[PDB]
Tab-separated table of N, CA and C in Angstrom:
chain	number	residue	atom	x	y	z
A	350	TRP	N	0.860	-1.159	0.019
A	350	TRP	CA	0.174	0.113	-0.158
A	350	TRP	C	0.867	1.094	0.010
A	351	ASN	N	1.291	1.696	-1.152
A	351	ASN	CA	2.352	2.675	-1.376
A	351	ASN	C	1.517	4.052	-1.688
A	352	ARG	N	1.508	4.629	-0.425
A	352	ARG	CA	0.722	6.069	-0.121
A	352	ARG	C	1.690	7.238	-0.652
A	353	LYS	N	2.000	7.779	-1.705
A	353	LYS	CA	2.983	8.827	-1.992
A	353	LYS	C	2.275	9.968	-1.465
A	354	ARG	N	3.044	10.660	-0.773
A	354	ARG	CA	2.828	11.891	0.037
A	354	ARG	C	3.056	12.984	-0.775
A	355	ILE	N	2.099	14.130	-1.348
A	355	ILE	CA	2.621	15.226	-2.308
A	355	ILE	C	2.182	16.494	-1.281
A	356	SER	N	3.184	17.233	-1.314
A	356	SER	CA	3.211	18.729	-0.657
A	356	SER	C	4.294	19.464	-1.210
A	357	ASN	N	3.905	20.603	-0.970
A	357	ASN	CA	5.107	21.867	-1.594
A	357	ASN	C	5.346	21.475	-2.949
A	358	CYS	N	4.166	21.511	-3.731
A	358	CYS	CA	4.511	21.238	-5.180
A	358	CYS	C	3.515	22.632	-6.004
A	359	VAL	N	3.737	22.560	-7.350
A	359	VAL	CA	3.118	23.417	-7.945
A	359	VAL	C	2.377	22.506	-8.964
A	360	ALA	N	1.139	21.810	-8.714
A	360	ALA	CA	0.637	20.800	-9.538
A	360	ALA	C	-0.102	21.373	-10.776
A	361	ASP	N	0.791	21.134	-11.969
A	361	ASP	CA	0.448	21.336	-13.307
A	361	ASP	C	-0.466	19.993	-13.749
A	362	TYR	N	-1.738	20.104	-13.813
A	362	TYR	CA	-2.223	18.937	-14.198
A	362	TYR	C	-2.670	18.708	-15.792
A	363	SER	N	-1.936	19.837	-16.689
A	363	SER	CA	-2.086	19.606	-18.071
A	363	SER	C	-1.091	18.328	-18.532
A	364	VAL	N	0.182	18.534	-17.867
A	364	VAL	CA	0.963	17.335	-18.175
A	364	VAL	C	0.370	15.775	-17.897
A	365	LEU	N	-0.224	15.733	-16.858
A	365	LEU	CA	-1.041	14.516	-16.172
A	365	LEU	C	-1.994	14.360	-17.486
A	366	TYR	N	-2.928	15.525	-17.782
A	366	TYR	CA	-4.087	15.361	-18.726
A	366	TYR	C	-3.629	14.700	-20.061
A	367	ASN	N	-2.292	15.143	-20.464
A	367	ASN	CA	-1.561	14.975	-21.887
A	367	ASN	C	-0.653	13.661	-21.560
A	368	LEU	N	-0.612	12.996	-20.542
A	368	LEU	CA	0.135	11.770	-20.561
A	368	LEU	C	-0.123	10.730	-21.252
A	369	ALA	N	0.560	10.089	-21.956
A	369	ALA	CA	0.149	8.899	-22.984
A	369	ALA	C	-0.446	7.844	-22.454
A	370	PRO	N	-0.123	7.091	-21.102
A	370	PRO	CA	-0.805	5.628	-20.953
A	370	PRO	C	-2.236	5.963	-20.235
A	371	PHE	N	-2.245	6.992	-19.235
A	371	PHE	CA	-3.496	7.098	-18.718
A	371	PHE	C	-4.497	7.969	-19.300
A	372	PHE	N	-5.905	7.647	-19.198
A	372	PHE	CA	-6.868	8.183	-20.145
A	372	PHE	C	-7.985	8.621	-19.175
A	373	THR	N	-8.661	7.742	-18.311
A	373	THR	CA	-9.479	7.931	-17.625
A	373	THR	C	-9.391	9.108	-16.158
A	374	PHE	N	-10.532	9.998	-16.047
A	374	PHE	CA	-10.013	11.072	-15.246
A	374	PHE	C	-11.165	11.305	-14.248
A	375	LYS	N	-11.831	10.244	-13.707
A	375	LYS	CA	-13.137	10.350	-12.890
A	375	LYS	C	-12.614	11.174	-11.877
A	376	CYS	N	-13.692	12.149	-11.596
A	376	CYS	CA	-13.516	12.791	-10.020
A	376	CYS	C	-14.840	12.831	-9.358
A	377	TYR	N	-14.736	12.685	-8.148
A	377	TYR	CA	-15.513	13.130	-6.993
A	377	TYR	C	-15.321	14.309	-6.193
A	378	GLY	N	-16.128	15.269	-5.646
A	378	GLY	CA	-16.190	16.546	-5.012
A	378	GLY	C	-15.689	17.686	-5.612
A	379	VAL	N	-14.722	17.361	-6.791
A	379	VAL	CA	-14.369	18.620	-7.395
A	379	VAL	C	-14.199	18.553	-8.927
A	380	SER	N	-14.248	19.463	-9.643
A	380	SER	CA	-14.307	19.426	-11.164
A	380	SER	C	-13.187	19.245	-11.757
A	381	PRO	N	-12.679	18.713	-13.049
A	381	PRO	CA	-11.378	18.605	-13.401
A	381	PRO	C	-10.958	20.083	-14.018
A	382	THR	N	-11.856	20.645	-14.789
A	382	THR	CA	-11.439	21.956	-15.526
A	382	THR	C	-11.041	22.931	-14.357
A	383	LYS	N	-11.606	22.662	-13.248
A	383	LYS	CA	-11.118	23.541	-12.021
A	383	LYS	C	-9.827	23.326	-11.397
A	384	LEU	N	-9.238	22.201	-11.894
A	384	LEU	CA	-8.049	21.358	-10.924
A	384	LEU	C	-7.036	22.177	-10.940
A	385	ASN	N	-6.835	23.146	-11.923
A	385	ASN	CA	-5.602	24.157	-11.957
A	385	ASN	C	-5.662	25.233	-11.208
A	386	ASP	N	-7.083	25.642	-10.641
A	386	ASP	CA	-7.423	26.869	-9.961
A	386	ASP	C	-7.322	26.805	-8.426
A	387	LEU	N	-7.328	25.807	-7.766
A	387	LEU	CA	-7.440	25.306	-6.388
A	387	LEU	C	-6.043	25.283	-5.621
A	388	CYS	N	-6.295	25.198	-4.356
A	388	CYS	CA	-5.078	24.871	-3.245
A	388	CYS	C	-5.403	23.927	-2.683
A	389	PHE	N	-4.853	22.818	-2.349
A	389	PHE	CA	-4.850	21.671	-1.446
A	389	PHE	C	-3.713	21.614	-0.473
A	390	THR	N	-4.222	21.347	0.896
A	390	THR	CA	-3.343	21.161	1.885
A	390	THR	C	-2.263	20.126	1.849
A	391	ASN	N	-2.640	18.802	1.533
A	391	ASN	CA	-1.896	17.829	1.187
A	391	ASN	C	-2.668	16.812	0.303
A	392	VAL	N	-1.847	16.236	-0.881
A	392	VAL	CA	-2.450	15.361	-1.705
A	392	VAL	C	-1.763	13.672	-1.146
A	393	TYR	N	-2.407	12.812	-1.642
A	393	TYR	CA	-2.127	11.489	-1.341
A	393	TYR	C	-2.426	10.590	-2.753
A	394	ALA	N	-1.400	9.808	-3.088
A	394	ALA	CA	-1.630	9.123	-4.057
A	394	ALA	C	-1.295	7.712	-4.043
A	395	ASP	N	-2.079	6.899	-4.503
A	395	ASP	CA	-2.092	5.351	-4.363
A	395	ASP	C	-2.051	4.703	-5.835
A	396	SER	N	-0.916	3.936	-6.175
A	396	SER	CA	-0.540	3.572	-7.460
A	396	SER	C	-0.619	2.121	-7.212
A	397	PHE	N	-1.717	1.310	-7.668
A	397	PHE	CA	-1.983	-0.105	-7.435
A	397	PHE	C	-2.142	-0.581	-9.085
A	398	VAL	N	-1.927	-1.975	-9.292
A	398	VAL	CA	-2.466	-2.712	-10.225
A	398	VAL	C	-3.781	-3.692	-9.983
B	499	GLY	N	-3.160	3.967	-27.471
B	499	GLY	CA	-4.563	3.657	-26.490
B	499	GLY	C	-5.604	4.152	-26.998
B	500	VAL	N	-6.710	3.825	-26.445
B	500	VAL	CA	-7.951	4.185	-26.601
B	500	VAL	C	-8.420	5.364	-26.307
B	501	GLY	N	-7.727	6.034	-25.229
B	501	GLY	CA	-7.846	7.430	-25.196
B	501	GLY	C	-7.037	8.329	-25.799
B	502	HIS	N	-6.110	7.812	-26.460
B	502	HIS	CA	-5.172	8.831	-27.301
B	502	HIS	C	-5.487	8.243	-28.786
B	503	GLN	N	-6.173	7.186	-29.135
B	503	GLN	CA	-6.676	7.160	-30.493
B	503	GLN	C	-7.352	8.323	-30.953
B	504	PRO	N	-7.391	8.843	-32.535
B	504	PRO	CA	-8.381	9.752	-32.723
B	504	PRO	C	-9.618	9.376	-32.925
B	505	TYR	N	-10.678	9.988	-32.697
B	505	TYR	CA	-12.082	9.931	-32.641
B	505	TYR	C	-12.630	11.172	-33.697
B	506	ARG	N	-13.631	10.522	-34.651
B	506	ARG	CA	-14.251	11.763	-35.479
B	506	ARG	C	-15.270	11.903	-34.557
B	507	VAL	N	-15.664	13.202	-34.551
B	507	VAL	CA	-16.619	13.850	-33.720
B	507	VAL	C	-17.643	14.575	-34.536
B	508	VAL	N	-18.837	14.531	-34.669
B	508	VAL	CA	-19.694	15.235	-35.275
B	508	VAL	C	-20.688	15.905	-34.237
B	509	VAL	N	-20.537	17.391	-34.564
B	509	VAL	CA	-21.395	18.283	-33.592
B	509	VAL	C	-22.664	18.849	-34.287
B	510	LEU	N	-23.654	18.750	-33.821
B	510	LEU	CA	-24.945	19.318	-34.441
B	510	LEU	C	-25.296	20.379	-33.408
B	511	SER	N	-25.500	21.398	-33.715
B	511	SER	CA	-26.061	22.829	-33.366
B	511	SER	C	-27.338	23.221	-33.648
B	512	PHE	N	-28.503	22.433	-32.763
B	512	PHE	CA	-29.658	22.861	-33.092
B	512	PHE	C	-30.276	24.096	-33.076
B	513	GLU	N	-30.977	24.528	-33.577
B	513	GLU	CA	-31.669	26.020	-33.501
B	513	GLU	C	-32.987	25.871	-33.155
B	514	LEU	N	-33.697	26.083	-31.811
B	514	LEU	CA	-34.820	26.197	-31.301
B	514	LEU	C	-35.196	27.500	-31.117
B	515	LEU	N	-36.064	27.973	-32.306
B	515	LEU	CA	-36.217	29.510	-32.367
B	515	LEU	C	-37.807	29.672	-32.641
B	516	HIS	N	-38.580	30.461	-32.442
B	516	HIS	CA	-39.883	30.739	-32.680
B	516	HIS	C	-40.090	31.006	-34.093
B	517	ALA	N	-39.238	31.406	-34.797
B	517	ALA	CA	-39.079	31.664	-36.524
B	517	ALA	C	-39.996	30.396	-37.297
B	518	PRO	N	-40.531	30.811	-38.269
B	518	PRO	CA	-41.130	29.678	-39.080
B	518	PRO	C	-39.892	28.369	-39.458
B	519	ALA	N	-40.025	27.433	-38.950
B	519	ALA	CA	-39.245	26.400	-38.926
B	519	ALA	C	-38.982	25.747	-40.613
B	520	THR	N	-37.772	25.398	-40.994
B	520	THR	CA	-37.573	24.653	-41.975
B	520	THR	C	-37.080	23.279	-41.973
B	521	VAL	N	-36.561	22.814	-40.964
B	521	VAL	CA	-36.317	21.477	-40.924
B	521	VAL	C	-37.368	20.733	-39.970
B	522	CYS	N	-37.772	19.668	-40.151
B	522	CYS	CA	-38.760	18.967	-39.415
B	522	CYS	C	-38.525	17.411	-39.662
B	523	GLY	N	-39.116	16.664	-38.498
B	523	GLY	CA	-39.024	15.175	-38.392
B	523	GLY	C	-40.133	14.676	-39.481
B	524	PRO	N	-40.285	13.251	-39.610
B	524	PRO	CA	-41.280	12.655	-40.309
B	524	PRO	C	-42.544	12.817	-39.792
B	525	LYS	N	-43.448	13.604	-40.318
B	525	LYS	CA	-44.860	13.735	-39.695
B	525	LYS	C	-45.756	14.300	-40.937
B	526	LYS	N	-46.947	13.772	-40.898
B	526	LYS	CA	-47.826	14.265	-42.080
B	526	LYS	C	-48.793	15.257	-41.476
B	527	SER	N	-49.110	16.082	-42.438
B	527	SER	CA	-50.214	17.142	-41.940
B	527	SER	C	-51.971	16.889	-42.273
B	528	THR	N	-52.586	16.997	-41.249
B	528	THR	CA	-53.984	16.711	-41.307
B	528	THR	C	-54.830	17.652	-41.765
B	529	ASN	N	-56.104	17.701	-41.749
B	529	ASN	CA	-57.056	18.660	-41.942
B	529	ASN	C	-57.209	19.680	-40.864
B	530	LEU	N	-57.305	20.957	-41.032
B	530	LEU	CA	-57.590	22.171	-40.250
B	530	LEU	C	-58.983	22.254	-39.453
B	531	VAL	N	-59.167	22.133	-38.301
B	531	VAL	CA	-60.599	21.956	-37.775
B	531	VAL	C	-60.733	23.327	-36.975
B	532	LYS	N	-61.761	24.248	-37.145
B	532	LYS	CA	-62.128	25.360	-36.648
B	532	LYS	C	-63.149	25.212	-35.761
B	533	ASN	N	-63.454	26.218	-34.815
B	533	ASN	CA	-64.662	26.380	-33.985
B	533	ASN	C	-65.012	25.078	-33.250
B	534	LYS	N	-64.150	24.445	-32.684
B	534	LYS	CA	-64.346	23.171	-31.779
B	534	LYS	C	-62.991	22.950	-31.151
B	535	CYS	N	-63.484	22.427	-29.824
B	535	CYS	CA	-62.466	22.062	-28.688
B	535	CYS	C	-61.651	20.876	-29.237
B	536	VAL	N	-60.620	21.183	-29.992
B	536	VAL	CA	-59.710	20.162	-30.226
B	536	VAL	C	-58.367	20.068	-29.875
B	537	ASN	N	-57.593	18.959	-30.123
B	537	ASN	CA	-56.025	18.942	-29.535
B	537	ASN	C	-55.487	19.313	-30.783
B	538	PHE	N	-54.311	20.261	-30.846
B	538	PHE	CA	-53.512	20.900	-31.924
B	538	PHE	C	-52.266	20.511	-31.702
B	539	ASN	N	-51.428	20.557	-32.708
B	539	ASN	CA	-49.823	20.448	-32.824
B	539	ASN	C	-49.334	21.208	-34.060
B	540	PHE	N	-48.693	22.137	-33.533
B	540	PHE	CA	-48.302	23.224	-34.708
B	540	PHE	C	-46.606	23.371	-34.410
B	541	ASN	N	-46.070	22.639	-35.445
B	541	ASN	CA	-44.468	22.591	-35.650
B	541	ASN	C	-44.043	22.216	-34.235
B	542	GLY	N	-44.526	21.068	-33.479
B	542	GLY	CA	-43.877	20.642	-32.167
B	542	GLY	C	-44.626	21.516	-31.017
B	543	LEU	N	-45.453	22.400	-31.199
B	543	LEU	CA	-45.922	23.176	-29.998
B	543	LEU	C	-47.491	22.707	-29.827
B	544	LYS	N	-47.656	21.705	-28.819
B	544	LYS	CA	-48.681	21.053	-28.639
B	544	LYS	C	-49.614	21.836	-27.811
B	545	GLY	N	-50.869	21.305	-27.714
B	545	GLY	CA	-52.157	22.305	-26.859
B	545	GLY	C	-53.122	21.527	-27.145
B	546	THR	N	-54.078	22.181	-26.319
B	546	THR	CA	-55.620	21.618	-26.570
B	546	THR	C	-56.426	22.956	-26.281
B	547	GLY	N	-57.425	23.405	-27.442
B	547	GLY	CA	-58.169	24.437	-27.412
B	547	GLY	C	-59.200	24.391	-28.347
B	548	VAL	N	-59.739	25.796	-28.752
B	548	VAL	CA	-60.731	26.133	-29.820
B	548	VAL	C	-59.811	27.019	-30.648
């Protein structure tokens, strides 16, 4: 259970949106087009298969 | 990949206006009945009246 902690970033989501392998971008609670306009205290990433 | 493969996209921009319409779906026109309480349908505008 690898929980990557994300803090002190400038999260540009355009690189993630234009990333070659990953396609689906489902979101709950926030709007994806607004995702470059907000500030989060901490982000946590879980990358599984 | 599937999200990076090209997709042909067709956008139809419909015009819903109170002007006399030129494009319509397949439907026939019946006789015009006056001075009686009937149901009517003028170019998609439905109603019931005299």
